[PDB]
């Protein structure tokens, strides 16, 4: 048997029960009726939902290889998304992921470290924030540039100047695509149609934007082929090309110029928006909780001071800051259902039998907002990651990057970006709201499978 669920209607399954508006809350409501493991029907396609820590851990961690598949919907083929890391499966995924992890280690791309790349972006970020000259400002665009340029640095070896038109084009395309991809028409409703694409225009626009990106990446690969130093790979492209020229006696290979372009599009896609949104949300929460900000600044001033950049090494001496970043991620819950999984083979889970390829939906909300691990889980409070002594308290329930075999490839990178960008900002600025802090609402705007902060402005007042 599959896990029990609400009985589907004919030809529409469970669609009309589920509140598309806030899918996570519906899943949670269902869990109160059917328990931690239950089945929903998306017009005949069964979806098993895992809710709560135990179920999620059992599946993602203890039965990891079996739950390592990526769930497929029509959108995957309509936006040509299954050829990188994020939406790939089997051998293509294993190989590209493995390689990408090796390449993305702090020193996996020559002498220049990933941390160096992030540190340079943090100085640039601070500078743009000075240029606002302490006036009101929607930080959206500035905070989005920093992570985008980090990926640029990782892939092409060199960051762009924030005004370089080639950068502004990449960024604009990416924004467009992500905003389109956020629409419930594109994420949900159009997947109800298994064969006919009811938004052919939209997908065309998506693909055109991709092609622009892929074509820019091709220009660079060429440049990288004409300046290849086999002993000194400096970026993700070099590393990929060396992997190719190491596989030439083994075709057909998962490593080709085409998988390089698709993998890089994945890294831009995965690596920008979520980090950007997390940073923006962090500043909103810091505005609203100025005591919190002050405690971070106390750590900064005491451990780091003013005569130098904040580096990772600092993080182990700054538990309060570490707790603040962790708590931002836990509270805001940007991917409440992760990305969909799928079982790779027939598998007995608990006392249910789940057939190979069945889509699994993991509720990360249920873990991050566990009300016993994180009492008052609905409140932002850095103490959720602090012991009674004021030290950092780890949580097995801290899964904003998901868990198991499909855990975010950028976990460590996003971790550096968040810590270095936040510390560098509060090293150099205080934060002043336009409106009254008591009047700001930090509660998240959900629209489908995606959380987002509300709109706000602030002033970056130099110290
Ligand atoms: C705070 C920022 C980020 C968050 C919260 C985040 C979170 C996630 C989550 C939840 C997943 C899905 C895991 C799953 O399928 O179960 C994921 C996948 C991924 N993330 Fe991130 N991510 C972030 C930043 C980044 C960055 C900076 C990169 C850049 C390398 C990146 C690369 C990826 C990739 C490649 C995947 C696909 C992994 C796979 O399916 O095998 N992410 N991320
Ligand atoms: C039809 C093939 C042309 C594809 C295309 N490439 C780009 Cl670039 C544009 C800019 O709008 N477009 C057109 C486009 C037209 C309508 C939409 C759209 C916007 C809101 C709601 C539904 C649609 C839609 N897409 N397809 N049909 N209707 C999106 C892109
Ligand atoms: C100009 C190119 C912009 C990026 C982009 N446009 C499209 Cl279309 C693709 C499809 O993969 N992509 C790549 C992409 C890959 C993964 C994601 C992603 C990664 C982690 C978590 C959620 C997402 C997601 N899926 N849909 N929207 N955002 C977003 C975009
Ligand atoms: O597999 C059964 C098929 O039925 C559909 O739900 C149609 O709603 C598709 O999403 C799925 O592919
Ligand atoms: K049209």
UniProtKB/Swiss-Prot annotation:
GO terms for biological process: amide metabolic process; cholesterol metabolic process; epoxygenase P450 pathway; estrogen metabolic process; icosanoid biosynthetic process; long-chain fatty acid biosynthetic process; monocarboxylic acid metabolic process; monoterpenoid metabolic process. Heme binds at residue 408. The keyword Oxidoreductase applies. It is a peripheral membrane protein. Transmembrane segments: none annotated. CDD domains: CYP2C-like. This is Cytochrome P450 2C9. Its cofactor is heme. The keyword Cytoplasm does not apply. Changing residue 332 to L: In allele CYP2C9*3; responsible for the tolbutamide poor metabolizer phenotype. Induction: By rifampicin. It comes from Homo sapiens (Human). Belongs to the cytochrome P450 family. It holds the Pfam family p450. One of its GO terms (cellular component) is plasma membrane. Pathway: Lipid metabolism; arachidonate metabolism; Steroid metabolism; cholesterol metabolism; Terpene metabolism; (4R)-limonene degradation. Changing residue 332 to T: In allele CYP2C9*4. It catalyses: an organic molecule + reduced [NADPH--hemoprotein reductase] + O2 = an alcohol + oxidized [NADPH--hemoprotein reductase] + H2O + H(+); (5Z,8Z,11Z,14Z)-eicosatetraenoate + reduced [NADPH--hemoprotein reductase] + O2 = (8R,9S)-epoxy-(5Z,11Z,14Z)-eicosatrienoate + oxidized [NADPH--hemoprotein reductase] + H2O + H(+); (5Z,8Z,11Z,14Z)-eicosatetraenoate + reduced [NADPH--hemoprotein reductase] + O2 = (8S,9R)-epoxy-(5Z,11Z,14Z)-eicosatrienoate + oxidized [NADPH--hemoprotein reductase] + H2O + H(+); (5Z,8Z,11Z,14Z)-eicosatetraenoate + reduced [NADPH--hemoprotein reductase] + O2 = (11R,12S)-epoxy-(5Z,8Z,14Z)-eicosatrienoate + oxidized [NADPH--hemoprotein reductase] + H2O + H(+). A cytochrome P450 monooxygenase involved in the metabolism of various endogenous substrates, including fatty acids and steroids. Mechanistically, uses molecular oxygen inserting one oxygen atom into a substrate, and reducing the second into a water molecule, with two electrons provided by NADPH via cytochrome P450 reductase (NADPH--hemoprotein reductase). Catalyzes the epoxidation of double bonds of polyunsaturated fatty acids (PUFA). Catalyzes the hydroxylation of carbon-hydrogen bonds. Changing residue 98 to H: In allele CYP2C9*35. Gene3D superfamilies: Cytochrome P450 (1.10.630.10). It is found in: Endoplasmic reticulum membrane; Microsome membrane.
């Amino acid at each position: 048997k599959l896990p029990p669920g609400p009985t589907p209607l004919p030809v529409i399954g469970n669609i009309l029960q589920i509140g598309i508006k806030d899918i996570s809350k519906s899943l949670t409501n269902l869990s109160k009726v059917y328990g931690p493991v239950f089945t929903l029907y998306f017009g005949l396609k069964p979806i098993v939902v895992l809710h709560g820590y135990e179920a999620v851990k059992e599946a993602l961690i203890d039965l990891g290889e079996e739950f390592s598949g990526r769930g497929i919907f029509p959108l995957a083929e309509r936006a040509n998304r299954g050829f990188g890391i994020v939406f790939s499966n089997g051998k293509k995924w294993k190989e590209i992921r493995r390689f990408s992890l090796m390449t993305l280690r702090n020193f996996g791309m020559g002498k220049r470290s990933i941390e160096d790349r992030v540190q340079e972006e943090a100085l640039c970020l601070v500078e743009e924030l000075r240029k606002t000259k302490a006036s009101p400002c929607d930080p959206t665009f500035i905070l989005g540039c920093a992570p985008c340029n980090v990926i640029c640095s990782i892939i092409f070896h060199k960051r762009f100047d924030y005004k370089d038109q080639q950068f502004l084009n990449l960024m604009e395309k990416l924004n467009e695509n992500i905003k389109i991809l956020s629409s419930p028409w594109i994420q949900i409703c159009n997947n109800f149609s298994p064969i006919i694409d009811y938004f052919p225009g939209t997908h065309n626009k998506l693909l055109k934007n991709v092609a622009f990106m892929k074509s820019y990446i091709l220009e660079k690969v060429k440049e990288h082929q004409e300046s290849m130093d086999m002993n000194n790979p400096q970026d993700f492209i070099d590393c990929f090309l060396m992997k190719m020229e190491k596989e030439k006696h083994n075709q057909p290979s998962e490593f080709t110029i085409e998988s390089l372009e698709n993998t890089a599009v994945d890294l831009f896609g995965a690596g920008t928006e979520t980090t950007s949104t997390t940073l923006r949300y962090a500043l909103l929460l810091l505005l609203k909780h100025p005591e919190v900000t002050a405690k971070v600044q106390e750590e900064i001033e005491r451990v780091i001071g003013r005569n130098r950049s904040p580096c990772m090494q600092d993080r182990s001496h700054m538990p309060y800051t570490d707790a603040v970043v962790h708590e931002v991620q836990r509270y805001i819950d940007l991917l409440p259902t992760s990305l969909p999984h799928a079982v790779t083979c027939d598998i007995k889970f608990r006392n249910y039998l789940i057939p190979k390829g069945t889509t699994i939906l993991i509720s990360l909300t249920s873990v991050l907002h566990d009300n016993k691990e994180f009492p008052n889980p609905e409140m932002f409070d850095p103490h959720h990651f602090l012991d009674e002594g004021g030290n950092f308290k780890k949580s097995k329930y801290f899964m904003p990057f998901s868990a198991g075999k499909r855990i975010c490839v950028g976990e460590a990178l996003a971790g550096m970006e968040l810590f270095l960008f936040l510390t560098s900002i509060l090293q150099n600025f205080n934060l002043k709201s336009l409106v009254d802090p008591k009047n700001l609402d930090t509660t998240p705007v959900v629209n489908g499978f995606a959380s987002v902060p509300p709109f706000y402005q602030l002033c970056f007042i130099p110290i």
